C-alpha cells in the first residue's frame, strides 16, 4: 500500500533472459508452425475464429521495441501462441503435437529461469 512495499525483485535482466528463451523457441525443430503469422487470406476460418493471432516473429518485434511492460505480458503472448494452436488444430496432427511440445519446452525454461 502507500509507503509500504515488498522488497524489490531484480528485474534488470528480464529483457535479456526473455530474448534468450525466445531464441531457443525460434530454433527448436518443432517451431515451424509458429515462426510467422498465419496467412489470413490463405487459411479459411482463421480470421474469424482466432480473435488474437500471435506468432514468434510478432513476439520478437514487440520485445525488441519495448512493447512488453513486464515478463508476465511476454509469457501471456507466448502462451497465446499455443492456445491458438490448440483451438484450431486437432491434438493428433503434426501442428497439434508441435504445439504441445513447444508449450512444454517453454514452460520448463520459464520455471528454470524465473521461479
Residue 63 contacts residue 16 (beta carbons within 8 Å): no
Widest Cα–Cα separation across the chain = 55
Resolution in A: 1.9
* DSSP code, position 33: G
Residue 1 structural domain: 1-115
Domain count, the chain: 1
CATH number of the CATH domain containing 95:
1.20.920.10
Q: Which residues contact 99 (CB under 8 A, 6 or more apart)?
A: 33, 34, 82, 85, 86, 89
Q: Are 72 and 110 in contact (CB under 8 A)?
A: no
Residues 75, 81, 86, 88, Cα dihedral to 10°: 160
Amino acid at each position: 500500500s502507500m509507503s509500504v512495499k515488498k522488497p524489490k525483485r531484480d528485474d534488470s535482466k528480464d529483457l535479456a533472459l526473455c530474448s534468450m528463451i525466445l531464441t531457443e523457441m525460434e530454433t527448436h525443430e518443432d517451431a515451424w508452425p509458429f515462426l510467422l503469422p498465419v496467412n489470413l487470406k490463405l487459411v479459411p476460418g482463421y480470421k474469424k475464429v482466432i480473435k488474437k493471432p500471435m506468432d514468434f516473429s510478432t513476439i520478437r518485434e514487440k520485445l525488441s521495441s519495448g512493447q512488453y511492460p513486464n515478463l508476465e505480458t511476454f509469457a501471456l503472448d507466448v502462451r497465446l501462441v499455443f492456445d491458438n494452436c490448440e483451438t484450431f488444430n486437432e491434438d493428433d496432427s503434426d501442428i497439434g503435437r508441435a504445439g504441445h511440445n513447444m508449450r512444454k519446452y517453454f514452460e520448463k525454461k520459464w520455471t528454470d529461469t524465473f521461479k
